[PDB]
């Protein structure tokens, strides 16, 4: 139906379970899958890794039937952070289409990032478009929880707000940005334009005026 | 032969006879035992007696052993045409073998005399290609068991290849032998007639053949 | 060994005919067996249908009656076509080169044994959207530096405003310029449109006329705009 | 020379007749295992030795086929069966209709066959008698005959093999079929007469005779076609057959070197205890726990074509003919085209084509090493037999939990003539054993029953002191 | 041993007589269990020994030869039945094809065995004694 | 009531060794001995030995304890008291005084006194020892002749003529024709060959319905010669 969660402590050995366990004799495979790019098988026969997989990965035989095919991954790293299937095939079940369950993976114990955040008000041939959007963008802060407020001076915008999840970047860490729409008389009216970023506890305030 | 029989001995018909047979002590019946066989010529010999007194298996009570300390005696009462033949003994123990003796010619006297039968045979047409000529002078049923043979060429004796058989007993309990002559075609073209003679003891029989016919 | 390249549509019409394109490199198509696996958003990836070296074609049975896979022979590619396509069809589409697998578990003239196949080398996957919207072109507005932190940087962005469907491909100097760069995941306005936005953090010293000129393409809409970026003014 | 009549009681003479042995094996102790059918409660424990005395200047008549110490051990073979089968738990609840669906097998894709194993539900009793309970088990599909439809792989209605010819009475967990040694002695007043020749034929004179108190280990195995764990013959590989020109009769190999077969069941069962009655707890097969094989028999090819060889040189001493075909049997009754037998409960049914299917010529007219490509034999199983003959009533072998591995030494074969064509231009040979007895002719064939009579009426040159005689 | 002197002569085999009828009936007395109907056929077949035994013990009984095993009579021998002498019988002939032999006739032995002696002793013993 | 059968007459150089065989049945082979006898012409019976099928004993008299080998043969059971042995003798260097016949005997008693006693003799076997080699017989017809005019009573038979060395055996028939059959023996020719005739009176009325083949065979030589007698008399005795 969904994906099923996990949590694993930084550097540490990780025993990702598989679900529906096998009725037989087995041949599993796992695969590693980031969101957005192409999956990777980590074990194609249980035991057996294809050249160019790291050794930290290992599956369980089949040598005694019985056991439960456990995808073990020693030294947990930031990069280890993705989703994990298990295509089971054994000799009682049939034909065997449909990939496991996902096993969404997540690293705890990582350092905290302050968030980076760069405000950019609307150019100059958008407001020759009639059209104004105040781009805060963040990046580079862990973990993935954000919030973005905008301030009118002193005063909460609340209005035409729009905010993307925060996504993992290539750092390893995370990135979101948040746009405001405002037409080009509401930017050039009010004396200064803030955006606010909390995160954890902090709250970092970046503040851009009119030319 | 050490253990020693008598040579011949003879009964009358319907009578009986006593064979001896003995030897030295350390052959002879102090510890040994005899038995009897008889024993025609061109025959296998049959157990009459064994151990001394009984007798073989299906044996008539006709003969009989009686065994001393320095001989063994076999009588055969009540004579028959059969008995006239030869007869041995053998001195044996439990493990040693026969130890056989000379033989005797047992004799039945008092029988009727019989009638030669004489057939003269010719060489036939193939024996003339070989190239032989042999003459072949059959005699049986004659009793007793002696005859005196001759031949003759064109009435003159012949003694050129000639060759007598001794006689033999039928299983009629008569006696009968053959004679040869053996010659060459010339001898056999050269007379008028060739005769067998057989002379007996009470008639003188001859029987011709011409060689031309 | 083997490299493959996707290459498809990106925005196909309900009820009807998606086809998606898969390039070859390494080897030829004969050599090995060939999968197609789609994942859609809020769902896991699924096995659609494997095609093998003697043009033998097996199919899912949830799309058995509606998925056909092919190969071509003179030219090193696989076609994927899918016939009365839905909303629930729009999914990020990959091609695999798959191994065969023999599992022998018991006496082989019985039989005992049963084949698994295992998919080693993916390629990137083409993004592919259904629905009944149109097109749309971005427009491209550039974000002067602020000339931003203390002395010894700053930065300075591209604004990819309004634009369907997913995804744009942004660069800066057709690729000149390489280190610093970031771009961040596009929003989903309230119109139905998607907006992104590109940044590059290079020093202040170097904005006398260096000229930072990001180009932007989105196949779906056939538009390839540039834009130039200058400090400030006024 | 005067004979008397004279009474010697104790002389060595003896008659040919038939009277009852009995039993005796071995001791042999198990405390917790106990109740063997063939040996506790039907035998007994004998001596260290049963001595055998050589009859010197005997030749005696031997006849393995018109001999009773086979139609007494079939006989008591049966009883103990029937005896083994009278205190255990009985299924006559079990003819209740059976929902059956295929068991989950793996796509396929040379030719074999497959032993559906179906898994079958059904309301049955329980230790209440108003009260029911819906239990499920799992059935080969030998033991089962439809009712309905069958035709999909989904339900129908289904039917015990047994539930209308006879009622069937489950085994006791108890007892053990494993056969075990069993020696014939004979009775005061009798004895037995063993023929110590090693080439000797079925019957005729015997030179080397001797006389026993008790036979020799002899273990009660039943098969078909093959017949194992046995004696081995010295010497030569003799056949034996009561009539060699009878079409119809079969004909006993007793070979010189006994072949390895290895018969072996993968799959690790279970057993699941349903109660149908007060005390009744009917075993029944549990969910296979892994994979799911058929079991098997492997024989050494190497060994196994030498000795169809020699039994084929041996078939060509007796049959100045034409060329040894040997095949198959024609076809028809599982129980009679199947080497059928038992390893530890459960019954095995063996397809031998791939050992019968060789011809051999006179003229040779026409090699090398290939390793030990021992010859496979897929081999089914029952667990409702009525083998035995109709006497021996039903059984239902309760499932053995675990994998099963039995070795067994082939000693011998049952051949059978095939006839209707031409006289020596073709002989066929088919295996099959359609006679319970001729199973225990092979182990009876050196030893003879005859009765003592010791009355000797003999006269000597001896009389006694005739009533007047004392002083 | 039981039944050495089968293929023997009749003159070594009447030497042992004891051990053929040691084991004729002889069930030890143990000093040292049956159930069921299908132990009853073992309880059928003593019995049957025993009866085995106490029949010649009868005919022995009424031949005037109970306690001994070799024993004279007083019958004479019958020419018809065998024309064999001393060493035609005890040192050429088995028991076994000697008792074919008699076969024919035994059942007459039998008669005169109980008849011409206990039948006429058994009345010359009360007009004697 | 057995059978022992020798084989053929057979000849020999001077110096070699020949082995007689003595094949048995109609009793059981090891209960009794097997005795070889020989008779010369000169000095009459001789036993030479016996030997135990049962027991492997062996008895041979000092004369040919140096020459003779004598073995048996395991016997072959044919029912519960009869079977079946072969006896073997064989003697080595052999010598004109050699020649002779020679019998094998079966014992009378299985324990006793006279155990190996001599009771069931054999039909004979005629060794000979010469230098001269093997010479075939020539056979020819001996017409009928009259034996009774008024009994109507012929004779008529076959002449072996030329043959070494002894002996030959004549059947009638095919051994179907033995009533009335008289055989001579053989004469010793100047040559030192052999030559006997075979005579049969029958009656003069059968000569359409009743065949006249004079069987012939001489074994040593390997020779058999079959003569059909020729039918046509000139004895004007018979035709009355
Ligand atoms: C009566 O007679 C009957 C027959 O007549 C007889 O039936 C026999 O039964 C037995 C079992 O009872 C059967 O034995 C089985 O055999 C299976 C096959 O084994 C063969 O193949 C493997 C694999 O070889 C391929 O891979 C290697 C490595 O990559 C390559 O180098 C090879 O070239 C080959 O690759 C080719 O083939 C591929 C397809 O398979 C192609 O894709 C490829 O392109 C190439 O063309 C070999 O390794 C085997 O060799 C071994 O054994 C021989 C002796 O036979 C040794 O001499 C040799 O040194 C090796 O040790 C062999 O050639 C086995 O797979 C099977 O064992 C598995 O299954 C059991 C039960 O499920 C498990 O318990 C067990 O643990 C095994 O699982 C392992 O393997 C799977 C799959 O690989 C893994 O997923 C799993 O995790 C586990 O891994 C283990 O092994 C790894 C090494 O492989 C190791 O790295 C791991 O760490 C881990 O330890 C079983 O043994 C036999 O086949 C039957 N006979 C026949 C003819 O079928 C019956 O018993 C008789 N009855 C009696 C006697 O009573
Ligand atoms: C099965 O049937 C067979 C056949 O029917 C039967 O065998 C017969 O057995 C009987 C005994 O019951 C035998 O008869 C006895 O023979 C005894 C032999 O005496 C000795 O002499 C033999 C000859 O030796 C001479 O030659 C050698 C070498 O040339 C020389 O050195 C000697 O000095 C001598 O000159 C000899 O072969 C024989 O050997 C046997 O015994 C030795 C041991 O002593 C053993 O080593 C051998 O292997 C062999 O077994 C022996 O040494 C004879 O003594 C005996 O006479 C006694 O009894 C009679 C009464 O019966 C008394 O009157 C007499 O005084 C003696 O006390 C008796 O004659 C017969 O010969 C057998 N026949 C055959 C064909 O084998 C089996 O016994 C039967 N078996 C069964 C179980 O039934
Ligand atoms: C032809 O001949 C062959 C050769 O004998 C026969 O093969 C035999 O089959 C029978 C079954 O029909 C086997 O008996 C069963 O064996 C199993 C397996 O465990 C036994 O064998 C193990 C090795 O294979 C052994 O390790 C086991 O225990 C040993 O060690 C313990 C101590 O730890 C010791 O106490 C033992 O004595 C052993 O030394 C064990 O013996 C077993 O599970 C079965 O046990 C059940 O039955 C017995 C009956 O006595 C009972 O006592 C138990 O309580 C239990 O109920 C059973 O013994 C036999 O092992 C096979 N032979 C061999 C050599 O392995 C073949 O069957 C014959 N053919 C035919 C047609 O009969
Ligand atoms: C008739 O059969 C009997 C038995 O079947 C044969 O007796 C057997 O004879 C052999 C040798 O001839 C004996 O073998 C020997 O055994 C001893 C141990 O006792 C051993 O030390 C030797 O090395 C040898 O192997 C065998 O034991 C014996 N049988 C019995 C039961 O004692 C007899 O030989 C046969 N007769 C013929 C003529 O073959
Ligand atoms: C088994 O072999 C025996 C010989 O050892 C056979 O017995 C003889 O067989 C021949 C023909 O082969 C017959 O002529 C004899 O009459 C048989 N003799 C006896 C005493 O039976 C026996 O026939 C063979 N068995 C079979 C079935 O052929
Ligand atoms: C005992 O075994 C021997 C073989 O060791 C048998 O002897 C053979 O018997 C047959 C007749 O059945 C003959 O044709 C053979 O020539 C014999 N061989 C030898 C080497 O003698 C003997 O027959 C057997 N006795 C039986 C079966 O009673
Ligand atoms: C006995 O079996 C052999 C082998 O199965 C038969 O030989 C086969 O004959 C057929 C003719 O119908 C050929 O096509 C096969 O090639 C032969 N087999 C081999 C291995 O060459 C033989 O015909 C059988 N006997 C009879 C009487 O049918
Ligand atoms: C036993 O197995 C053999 C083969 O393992 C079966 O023989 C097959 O029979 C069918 C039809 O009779 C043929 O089409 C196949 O070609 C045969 N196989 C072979 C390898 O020749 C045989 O039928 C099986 N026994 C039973 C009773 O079914
Ligand atoms: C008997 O064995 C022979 C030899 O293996 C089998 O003959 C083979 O049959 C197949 C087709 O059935 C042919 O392709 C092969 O050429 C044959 N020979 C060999 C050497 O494989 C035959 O099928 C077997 N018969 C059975 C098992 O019933
Ligand atoms: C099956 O046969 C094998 C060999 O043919 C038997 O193994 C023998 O066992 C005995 C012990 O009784 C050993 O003395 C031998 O050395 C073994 N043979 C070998 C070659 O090692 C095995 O016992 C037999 N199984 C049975 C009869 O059940
Ligand atoms: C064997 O059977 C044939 C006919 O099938 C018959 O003529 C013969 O007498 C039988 N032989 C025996 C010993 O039963
Ligand atoms: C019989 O067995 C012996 C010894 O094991 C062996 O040498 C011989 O080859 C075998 N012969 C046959 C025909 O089985
Ligand atoms: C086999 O039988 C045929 C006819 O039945 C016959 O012609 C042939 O001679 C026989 N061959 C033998 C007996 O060896
Ligand atoms: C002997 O037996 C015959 C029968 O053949 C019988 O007539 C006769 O009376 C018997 N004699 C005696 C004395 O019993
Ligand atoms: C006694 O032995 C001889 C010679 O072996 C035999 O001919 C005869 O049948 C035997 N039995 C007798 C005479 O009762």
């Known amino acids: 139906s969904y994906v099923s969660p996990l949590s694993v402590a930084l550097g540490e050995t990780a025993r990702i379970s598989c679900g529906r366990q096998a009725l037989g004799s087995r041949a599993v495979q796992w695969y590693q899958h980031k969101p957005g790019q192409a999956p990777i098988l980590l074990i194609y026969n249980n035991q057996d890794r294809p050249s160019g997989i790291p050794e930290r990965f290992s599956g369980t035989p089949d040598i005694n039937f019985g056991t439960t095919a456990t995808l073990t991954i020693s030294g947990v790293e930031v990069g280890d952070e993705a989703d994990y299937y298990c295509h089971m095939w054994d000799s009682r079940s049939g034909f065997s289409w449909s990939f496991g369950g996902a096993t969404r993976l997540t690293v705890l114990s990582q350092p905290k990032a302050a968030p980076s955040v760069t405000l950019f008000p609307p150019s100059s041939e958008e407001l020759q478009a009639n059209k104004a959007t105040l781009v805060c963008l963040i990046s580079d802060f862990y973990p993935g929880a954000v919030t973005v407020a905008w301030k009118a001076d002193s005063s909460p915008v609340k209005a035409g707000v729009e905010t993307t999840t925060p996504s993992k970047q290539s750092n390893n860490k995370y990135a979101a940005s948040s746009y405001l729409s405002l037409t080009p008389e509401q930017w050039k009216s009010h004396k200064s334009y803030s955006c606010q970023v909390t995160h954890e506890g902090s709250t970092v305030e970046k503040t851009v005026a009119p030319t | 032969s050490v253990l020693t029989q008598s040579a011949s001995v003879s009964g009358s018909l319907g009578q009986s006879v006593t064979i001896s047979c003995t030897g030295p002590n350390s052959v002879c019946c102090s510890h040994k035992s005899i038995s009897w066989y008889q024993w025609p010529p061109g025959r296998a010999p049959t157990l009459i007696i064994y151990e001394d007194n009984e007798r073989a298996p299906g044996i008539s009570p006709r003969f009989s052993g009686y065994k001393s300390y320095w001989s063994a005696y076999l009588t055969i009462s009540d004579l028959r045409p059969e008995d006239e033949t030869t007869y041995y003994c053998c001195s044996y123990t439990h493990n040693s073998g026969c130890v056989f003796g000379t033989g005797t010619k047992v004799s039945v006297l008092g029988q009727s005399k019989a009638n030669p039968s004489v057939t003269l045979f010719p060489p036939s047409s193939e024996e003339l290609q070989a190239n032989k000529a042999t003459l072949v002078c059959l005699i049986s049923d004659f009793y007793p068991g002696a005859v005196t043979v001759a031949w003759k060429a064109d009435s003159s004796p012949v003694k050129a290849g000639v060759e007598t058989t001794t006689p033999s007993k039928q299983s009629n309990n008569k006696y009968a032998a053959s004679s040869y002559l053996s010659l060459t075609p010339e001898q056999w073209k050269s007379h008028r007639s060739y005769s067998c003679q057989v002379t007996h003891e009470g008639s003188t029989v001859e029987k011709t053949v011409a060689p031309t016919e | 060994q083997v490299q493959l390249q996707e290459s498809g549509p990106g925005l196909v019409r309900p009820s009807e005919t998606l086809s998606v394109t898969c390039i070859v490199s390494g080897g030829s198509i004969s050599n090995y067996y060939w999968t197609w696996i789609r994942q859609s958003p809020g769902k896991g990836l699924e096995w659609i249908g494997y095609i093998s070296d003697r043009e033998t074609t097996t199919y899912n049975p949830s799309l058995n009656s509606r998925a056909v896979i092919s190969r071509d022979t003179s030219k090193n590619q696989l076609s994927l076509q899918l016939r009365s396509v839905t909303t629930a069809d729009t999914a990020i589409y990959f091609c695999?080169?798959?191994?065969?697998?023999?599992?022998?578990?018991?006496?082989?003239?019985?039989?005992?044994?049963?084949?698994?196949?295992?998919?080693?080398?993916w390629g990137k996957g083409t993004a592919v959207t259904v629905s009944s919207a149109s097109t749309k072109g971005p427009s491209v507005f550039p974000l002067a530096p602020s000339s931003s932190t203390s002395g010894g940087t700053a930065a300075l962005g591209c604004l990819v405003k309004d634009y369907f469907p997913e995804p744009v491909t942004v660069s800066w100097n057709s690729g000149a310029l390489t280190s610093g760069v970031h771009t961040f995941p596009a929003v989903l306005q309230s119109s139905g449109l998607y907006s992104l936005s590109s940044v590059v953090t290079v020093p202040s010293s170097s904005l006398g006329t260096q000229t930072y000129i990001c180009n932007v393409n989105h196949k779906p809409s056939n538009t390839k705009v540039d834009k130039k970026v200058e400090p400030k003014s006024c | 020379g005067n004979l008397w009549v004279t009474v010697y009681y104790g002389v060595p003479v003896w008659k040919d007749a038939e009277t009852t042995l009995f039993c005796a094996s071995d001791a042999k102790a198990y405390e917790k295992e106990k109740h063997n059918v063939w040996a506790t409660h039907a035998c007994v424990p004998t001596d260290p030795n049963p001595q055998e005395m050589v009859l010197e200047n005997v030749t005696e008549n031997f006849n393995m086929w018109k001999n009773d110490m086979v139609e007494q051990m079939h006989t008591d073979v049966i009883s103990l069966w029937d005896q083994s089968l009278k205190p255990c738990v009985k299924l006559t609840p079990l003819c209740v209709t059976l929902e059956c669906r295929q068991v989950n097998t793996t796509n396929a894709t040379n030719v074999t066959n497959g032993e559906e194993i179906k898994n079958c539900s059904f309301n049955a009793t329980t230790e209440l008698r108003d009260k029911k309970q819906k239990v499920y088990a799992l059935f080969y599909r030998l033991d089962i005959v439809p009712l309905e439809e069958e035709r999909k792989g989904n339900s129908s209605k289904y039917r015990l093999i047994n539930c209308n010819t006879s009622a069937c009475t489950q085994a006791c967990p108890k007892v053990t079929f494993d056969p075990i040694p069993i020696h014939y002695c004979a009775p005061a007043g009798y004895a037995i007469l063993k023929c110590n020749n090693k080439t000797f034929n079925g019957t005729g004179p015997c030179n080397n005779v001797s006389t026993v108190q008790c036979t020799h280990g002899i273990k009660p195995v039943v098969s078909t076609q093959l017949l194992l764990n046995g004696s081995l013959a010295e010497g030569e590989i003799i056949i034996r057959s009561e009539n060699l020109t009878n079409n119809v009769k079969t004909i006993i190999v007793h070979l010189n070197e006994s072949v390895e077969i290895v018969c072996t069941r993968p799959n690790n069962n279970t057993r699941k205890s349903i109660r149908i009655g007060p005390g009744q707890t009917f075993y029944a097969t549990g969910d296979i726990i892994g994979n799911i094989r058929q079991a098997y028999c492997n024989i050494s090819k190497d060994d196994w074509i030498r000795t169809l060889q020699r039994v084929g040189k041996k078939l060509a001493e007796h049959f100045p003919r034409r060329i040894i075909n040997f095949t198959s049997p024609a076809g028809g009754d599982l129980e009679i085209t199947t080497h059928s037998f038992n390893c530890r409960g459960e019954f095995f049914y063996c397809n031998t084509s791939s050992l019968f299917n060789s011809t051999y010529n006179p003229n040779d007219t026409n090699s090398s090493s290939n390793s030990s490509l021992d010859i496979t034999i897929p081999c089914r199983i029952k667990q409702i037999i009525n083998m035995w003959q109709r006497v021996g009533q039903c059984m239902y072998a309760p499932p053995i939990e675990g994998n099963i591995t039995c070795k067994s030494n082939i000693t011998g074969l049952l051949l059978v003539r095939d006839g209707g064509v031409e006289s020596n231009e073709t002989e066929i040979f088919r295996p099959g054993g359609g006679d319970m007895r001729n199973n225990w002719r092979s182990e009876l064939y050196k030893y003879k029953v005859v009765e003592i009579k010791p009355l000797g009426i003999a006269p000597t040159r001896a009389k006694r002191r005739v009533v007047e005689g004392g002083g | 041993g039981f039944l050495g002197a089968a293929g023997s002569t009749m003159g070594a085999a009447s030497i042992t007589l004891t051990v053929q009828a040691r084991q004729l009936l002889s069930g030890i007395v143990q000093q040292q269990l049956q159930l069921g109907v299908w132990g009853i056929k073992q309880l059928q077949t003593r019995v049957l020994a025993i009866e085995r035994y106490l029949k010649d013990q009868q005919l022995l009984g009424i031949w005037g030869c109970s306690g001994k095993l070799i024993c004279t009579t007083a019958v004479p021998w019958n020419s018809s039945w065998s024309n064999k002498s001393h060493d035609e019988i005890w040192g050429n002939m088995t028991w076994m094809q000697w008792d074919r032999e008699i076969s024919n006739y035994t059942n007459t032995i039998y008669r005169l065995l109980e008849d011409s002696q206990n039948q006429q002793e058994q009345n010359e013993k009360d007009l004697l004694a | 009531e057995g059978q022992l059968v020798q084989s053929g007459a057979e000849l020999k150089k001077p110096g070699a060794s020949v082995k007689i065989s003595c094949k048995t049945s109609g009793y059981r082979f090891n209960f009794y001995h097997i005795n070889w006898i020989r008779q010369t012409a000169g000095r009459g019976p001789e036993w030479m030995g016996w030997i135990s099928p049962y027991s492997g004993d062996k008895n041979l008299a000092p004369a040919f304890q140096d020459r003779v080998i004598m073995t048996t043969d395991t016997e072959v059971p044919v029912t519960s008291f009869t079977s079946t042995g072969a006896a073997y003798m064989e003697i080595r260097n052999l010598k004109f005084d050699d020649t002779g016949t020679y019998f094998c005997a079966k014992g009378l008693l299985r324990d006793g006194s006279s155990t190996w006693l001599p009771y069931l003799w054999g039909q004979g076997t005629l060794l000979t020892v010469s230098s001269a080699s093997t010479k075939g017989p020539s056979v020819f017809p001996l017409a009928p002749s009259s034996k009774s005019t008024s009994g109507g009573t012929a004779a008529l038979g076959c002449l072996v003529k030329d043959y070494f060395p002894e002996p030959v055996t004549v059947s009638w028939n095919s051994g179907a024709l033995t009533s009335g059959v008289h055989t001579f023996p053989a004469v010793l020719q100047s040559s030192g060959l052999y030559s006997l005739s075979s005579v049969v009176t029958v009656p003069s009325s059968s000569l359409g319905t009743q065949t006249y083949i004079c069987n012939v065979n001489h074994k040593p030589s390997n020779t058999k010669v079959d003569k059909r007698v020729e039918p046509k008399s000139c004895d004007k005795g018979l035709e009355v």
């Open positions: 695999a080169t798959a191994r065969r697998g023999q599992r022998i578990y018991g006496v082989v003239s019985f039989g005992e044994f049963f084949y698994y196949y295992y998919m080693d080398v």
